[PDB]
């Protein structure tokens, strides 16, 4: 029998830096949607996309923001969760764990440089 | 904790959520030394010293702007802080954290499928 990774946590800087990659990643989906759109129907979309970006994605994932899209342009809506679940396979978050690794030890030691007698 | 506005514009997602995480641990660190210092004349300075910097942001690059700020007050506080938020980086569950990230993005769509499905 298998028993799978613990991927579970309450409040947590873990939970913190998950819903800001959440939003982070429906921000990325509405970029990538907006230069796809840049019919009548997709004029709309665009015109619909812009007035959404306008405003901010409270720090919820996006998901707030997502069901105002899906409210008024429910097909707009199918493609940005879409492109936003796709993106869980194309962002490398091991990169991402590399560069705040690397970058933080080069910014100590240029700290620690600095100020070394 | 905005990631995209933080790094430079024309930055990947990846490098800024990298910048993002680096002003995370940042504040972790400050948070996990300031109840150390609670539970010496030098250390009742640091504390008075880190009391005075959490009244203050570290907008941008990684903390690093807001750190040697600190070290300019006070050299041996600012190099706890950067000992403690360096720890930190094989603290942090890093596996579980994406996996959340996904599962929940995941779970979200599927509420608002469910929801519009009639
Ligand atoms: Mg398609």
Same mark, same amino acid.
């Given at each position: 029998?298998?028993?799978?990774? !613990?991927?579970?946590?309450? @409040?947590?800087?873990?939970?913190?830096? %998950?819903? =800001? #990659? *959440?939003?982070?990643?429906?921000?990325? /989906?509405?970029?990538?949607?907006?230069?796809?759109?840049?019919?009548?129907?997709?004029?709309?979309?665009?015109?619909?996309?812009?007035?959404?970006?306008?405003?901010?994605?409270?720090?919820?994932?996006? !998901?707030?923001?997502?069901? @105002?899209?899906?409210?008024?342009?429910? %097909?707009? =809506? #199918? *493609?940005?969760?879409?492109?936003?679940? /796709?993106?869980?396979?194309?962002?490398?978050?091991?990169?991402?764990?590399?560069?705040?690794?690397?970058?933080?030890?080069?910014?100590?030691?240029?700290?620690?440089?600095?100020?070394?007698?």
């Amino acid at each position: 029998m298998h028993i799978p990774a !613990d991927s579970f946590s309450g @409040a947590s800087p873990e939970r913190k830096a %998950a819903v =800001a #990659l *959440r939003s982070l990643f429906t921000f990325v /989906a509405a970029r990538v949607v907006l230069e796809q759109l840049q019919t009548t129907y997709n004029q709309q979309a665009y015109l619909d996309l812009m007035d959404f970006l306008g405003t901010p994605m409270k720090g919820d994932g996006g !998901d707030e923001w997502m069901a @105002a899209v899906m409210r008024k342009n429910h %097909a707009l =809506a #199918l *493609r940005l969760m879409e492109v936003r679940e /796709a993106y869980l396979d194309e962002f490398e978050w091991g990169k991402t764990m590399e560069m705040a690794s690397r970058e933080t030890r080069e910014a100590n030691t240029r700290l620690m440089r600095a100020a070394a007698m």
